[PDB]
């Protein structure tokens, strides 16, 4: 049986954050990825 091999999702991680004197809360962006495959 013929099977196709595709590498699973990988991509850069970016941290969106206001300056530390403003707040410590951050957000994370996973480039070019299903939101369903993050965990």
């Amino acid at each position: 049986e013929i099977l196709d091999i595709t590498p699973c999702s990988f991509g850069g991680v970016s941290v969106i954050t206001p300056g530390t004197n403003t707040s410590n809360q951050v957000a994370v962006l996973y480039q070019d990825v299903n939101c369903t495959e993050v965990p």
Partner: peptide, 22 residues
Amino acid sequence: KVTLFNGLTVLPPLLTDEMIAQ
């Protein structure tokens, strides 16, 4: 007219074509 893995990644532009048109 203009129509045309191993760590490669293509980042989308900050301004979409719609915003440039606007």
